[PDB]
Design a protein around this ligand. Sequence first.
Ligand SMILES: CC(=O)O[C@H]1CC(C)(C)C(=C=C/C(C)=C/C=C/C(C)=C/C=C/C=C(C)/C=C/C=C(\C)C(=O)C[C@@]23O[C@]2(C)C[C@@H](O)CC3(C)C)[C@](C)(O)C1
Ligand SMILES: CC(=O)O[C@H]1CC(C)(C)C(=C=C/C(C)=C/C=C/C(C)=C/C=C/C=C(C)/C=C/C=C(\C)C(=O)C[C@@]23O[C@]2(C)C[C@@H](O)CC3(C)C)[C@](C)(O)C1
Ligand code: KC2
Ligand code: KC2
Ligand code: KC2
Ligand code: KC2
Ligand code: KC2
Ligand SMILES: CC1=C(C#C/C(C)=C/C=C/C(C)=C/C=C/C=C(C)/C=C/C=C(C)/C=C/[C@@]23O[C@]2(C)C[C@@H](O)CC3(C)C)C(C)(C)C[C@H](O)C1
Lengths: 179, 211, 228, 238
Amino acid sequence: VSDMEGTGPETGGKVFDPMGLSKIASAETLAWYRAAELKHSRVAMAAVTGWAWVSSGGPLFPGYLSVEQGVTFESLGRDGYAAWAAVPEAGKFQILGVIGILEILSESAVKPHYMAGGTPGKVPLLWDPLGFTAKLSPETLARKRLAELKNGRLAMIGVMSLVSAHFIPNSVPLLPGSV
Amino acid sequence: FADEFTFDSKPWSSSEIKDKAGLEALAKKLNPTVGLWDPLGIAETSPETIGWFRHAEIKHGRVAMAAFVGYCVQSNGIHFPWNIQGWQGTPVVSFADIAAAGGPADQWDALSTPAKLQILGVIGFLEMWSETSVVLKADGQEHYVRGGKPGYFPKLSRSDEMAFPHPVPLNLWDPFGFTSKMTPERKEKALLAEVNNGRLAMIGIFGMISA
Amino acid sequence: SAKADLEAFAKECNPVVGYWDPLGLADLPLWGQDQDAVIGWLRHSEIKHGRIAMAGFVGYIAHANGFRFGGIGPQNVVPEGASAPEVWDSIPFLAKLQIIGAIGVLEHISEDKNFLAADGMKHYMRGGKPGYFPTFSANVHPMPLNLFDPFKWSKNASPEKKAKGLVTETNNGRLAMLGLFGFLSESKIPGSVPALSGIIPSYDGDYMQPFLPTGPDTSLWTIGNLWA
Amino acid sequence: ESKAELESLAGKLNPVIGYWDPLNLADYDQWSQGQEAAIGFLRHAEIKHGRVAMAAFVGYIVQSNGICWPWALTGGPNGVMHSDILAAGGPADQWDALPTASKLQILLFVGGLELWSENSYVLGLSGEKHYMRGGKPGFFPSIKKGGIPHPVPFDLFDPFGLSKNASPEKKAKGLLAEINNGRLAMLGIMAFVSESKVPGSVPALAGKIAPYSGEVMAPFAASDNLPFVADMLKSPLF
Ligand SMILES: CC(=O)O[C@H]1CC(C)(C)C(=C=C/C(C)=C/C=C/C(C)=C/C=C/C=C(C)/C=C/C=C(\C)C(=O)C[C@@]23O[C@]2(C)C[C@@H](O)CC3(C)C)[C@](C)(O)C1
Ligand SMILES: CC(=O)O[C@H]1CC(C)(C)C(=C=C/C(C)=C/C=C/C(C)=C/C=C/C=C(C)/C=C/C=C(\C)C(=O)C[C@@]23O[C@]2(C)C[C@@H](O)CC3(C)C)[C@](C)(O)C1
Ligand code: KC2
Ligand code: KC2
Ligand code: KC2
Ligand code: KC2
Ligand code: KC2
Ligand SMILES: CC1=C(C#C/C(C)=C/C=C/C(C)=C/C=C/C=C(C)/C=C/C=C(C)/C=C/[C@@]23O[C@]2(C)C[C@@H](O)CC3(C)C)C(C)(C)C[C@H](O)C1
């Protein structure tokens, strides 16, 4: 676990694992832990960015969401949970199904599997279609992967702060009681 | 300075009293009759504590004799003929008004607050100039706790590197050489006297305050 | 042997009494660890209790007699004339939380391998000095002053003087413990400390519950109080 | 510099004290670039605070005594006279009563000077380096030699060349005097402002410094209609 990346000056160069969950982790278990961390971090980054954009006041999507059934992007409202409640069940099922197809493609298509001796967090299609991170050297690429991990860990705490503010009202400061 | 702020002891290198025998010698020199009268046994202490007690006694002697003479003068009512305030567009107060305020404690009370602060500030400046080890070592002595003579006030007039930015005219003790040259041990006789009349003036000033 | 060191330390603390262990806690196997580790734990616990009790005594005189900082802060919700048990009860809940949390962070830094190793020391049960708070030389953000001797007044002090200082620390901490719980006991069993009869007022409320009463829920921040 | 040289300079500033760092801020490694870099930053901070504080002390004395300029500050048929800025109140109130453009351009001119000092290319072109990299701790480079497109008449330090051909000993003595005068002038200016805000805080000055209501450490007052200024000033503080 000491040679698995994610350590930084924030821990002090050492692994942050007080409960000792790394001691009972093999190579496969550690790979699973890193894969889950990478996935959760990416999901939380996207979730925080979306929720902040929607609730803050940014210019949301123009036009209709459903011409028939009369649901509009403006009409959905800026509360995140209310928006996800008011979006059509067809749209929710579609988002979830596409995410599921992508998850199963990440599991199967990447033949050297992250559990069976592979790189955790290597979803092949869903990364850099325009080739931006193509000429970066290994050193800066490792720096940016550590950036991904750190930013996403912060994003996970952010989205949990958001849902805590929505569920347990007046829980987190710097989040108005409604959400 | 941070290297000398030790909170601890360093070896002594002088003939200053650092034991009960040395205290007893000075005790008989002060008064052959009483000798050493130490019921609390504060002679059974370290050299630094012995020097601290010696300097504390001397300083109480200074302040007590000055206080007794000042008390006597202020009770006599020999006030100053000046005005004590009212030149930078402030109210006018006179030393006659301070005298008519009441007894000397009442006179100090009637003294204005910034006047009190300035007097105490001068006295504090004198105190820390005394305590400055670097000044004494530019001069010929050390801190009384670390083997220096208890009671020495360093010269306020000097031309050394450790001299004030503006020249100071005179020193605190012996400004015009009224001591000039006492004999090399008549100074010590006068020190013995100083301790004795210091104790007497101590008793006198506290008795007057009590009365 | 750690026991031999402890007996010598007790003789230094008081040669009349010497080693006084009527329960054999130094021989108790706490957590199944050996006698050296257990004695390390007991010495750390004694020093920690004594330290906190000395601070508690001085703070009892500070709060009960009336000694407050000025300005916007927790001091502005405590009623004037409040007694030492009402001061903690009257500060905001966030003040209680953050005080205990900062004390917790200091405990964590005290027992963390990182700081103790950066200072070239080990844990007090693993062959270390019982009662040693490490410098913040391994904290992520460079930290201005350390906890012990922040101005480094003891940068050059003799080891003998340091040993005597630790002997003083233990004894004064024990005595401060006795005095502080004298103050506490006089308020919940009157006539228990005869000298304090009439001085310490009675207090109805559990001392050992930190968060009871919860205290006010005020928001004392002024510039940028967006969280309110 | 190093701690040894800092101690020597402290001895030259006051031989009685010598080094006086009760916090050991020289050993406090901040910015994580070594004790030399940290001491350089602290020395520059001392020198720059001193320079600004002595300048502000003279400015406070001049403005608080009704010595406004004869010419106007704003231009137009209705322009805020410097006399009106004077009549706004005490000096802090004068600053708060300045036009927003005046405030912005003053602080941005100072900022231009600051970044000009901080740039290492211009420092190297004028000689010496950044103060955290071995250069002279407080040293404003030459706005001329930097190579600005139009030829400026004068540099910021010594525009007329009066300290030119100064003895190196006089230069060191002058830097010692700069640090000490700045050290005292910081207390002077903060004492003026503290008397303005809290009456009686500085007992000597009693009734001689005008009062002031708004926060002094707030360059933009309510008159400044800029993003977030009114929202910032909504909640006051001691
Ligand atoms: C006092 C208190 O309680 O405060 C409250 C309030 C507060 C602070 C608000 C709270 C919160 C929430 C927080 C702070 C949440 C943080 C969330 C976070 C940190 C979210 C990151 C998203 C990152 C994304 C989407 C990046 C995409 C980035 C992309 C697509 C890339 O990297 C692409 C690319 O770069 C590469 C890789 C290569 C380069 O060649 C360039 C390109 C562009 C090609 C809390 C927790 O509630 C606490
Ligand atoms: C939360 C909140 O809002 O709190 C409120 C409440 C609270 C905290 C109570 C408040 C307050 C009051 C405060 C903080 C007051 C602070 C007062 C302060 C800081 C007072 C210093 C005086 C120093 C003097 C006179 C030094 C002279 C020193 C001298 C003569 C020298 O400079 C000498 C020298 O150095 C030179 C020039 C250089 C060398 O050649 C030689 C030496 C070294 C010898 C506030 C502001 O209301 C805020
Ligand atoms: C208002 C305060 C005050 C009073 C009322 C007072 C009264 C008397 C009397 C009483 C009739 C005598 C007989 C006497 C004698 C001596 N005083 Mg003394 N004195 C006062 C103040 C100071 C100060 C500040 C110093 C000082 C000293 C000496 C020395 C040492 C000379 C030397 O050997 O250099 C001698 C002999 C200096 C010293 O070193 O004292 C250890 C020193 O600094 N005195 N002093
Ligand atoms: C509120 C808390 C508190 C109080 C009231 C208090 C009182 C006293 C008294 C007064 C009766 C004495 C005489 C004394 C003496 C020493 N204290 Mg102590 N102390 C407190 C806190 C800490 C902390 C945090 C540390 C510490 C230490 C030492 C060392 C060791 C020096 C060395 O060996 O370098 C010595 C000699 C450091 C250490 O290492 O202790 C093993 C250390 O980290 N103390 N301490
Ligand atoms: C030794 C203990 C201690 C430490 C080490 C420490 C550290 C930090 C850090 C770390 C970097 C941050 C970021 C931070 C932030 C805030 N602290 Mg805090 N703090 C400590 C103690 C207290 C007390 C006693 C109070 C307090 C408060 C607040 C408020 C909210 C103000 C408000 O909501 O009005 C904010 C934003 C006050 C409060 O909550 O008042 C209701 C309050 O009374 N803190 N505090
Ligand atoms: C800090 C120093 C400083 C510098 C280095 C500097 C340089 C330049 C340059 C060259 C680079 C030009 C070209 C220029 C032009 C104008 N300056 Mg300006 N200026 C500075 C300071 C002030 C202050 C305090 C004020 C001010 C103003 C104006 C007005 C409008 C007057 C009006 O309103 O009729 C005009 C046209 C006044 C104002 O109202 O600005 C909106 C005003 O109060 N300036 N200024
Ligand atoms: C508010 C602004 C300000 C004030 C009020 C002020 C006052 C005093 C005083 C009065 C108490 C003295 C006695 C003094 C003396 C010297 N100042 Mg100085 N000064 C200010 C600003 C600057 C700047 C920006 C620089 C500077 C410098 C020098 C040098 C050059 C030495 C050399 O050539 O080696 C010497 C001798 C330049 C330098 O290089 O300093 C290392 C430099 O860049 N000063 N300065
Ligand atoms: C109000 C105002 C104005 C003003 C003003 C000004 C300039 C006011 C100035 C006031 C001033 C300059 C006040 C000094 C007091 C000094 C004292 C008390 C010294 C005692 C000193 C003593 C007791 C010294 C004793 C010794 O030294 C002796 C004798 C010999 C040495 O061997 C030993 C010692 C050291 C012990 C203007 C300019 C008119 C207009 C403006 O608009 C507003």
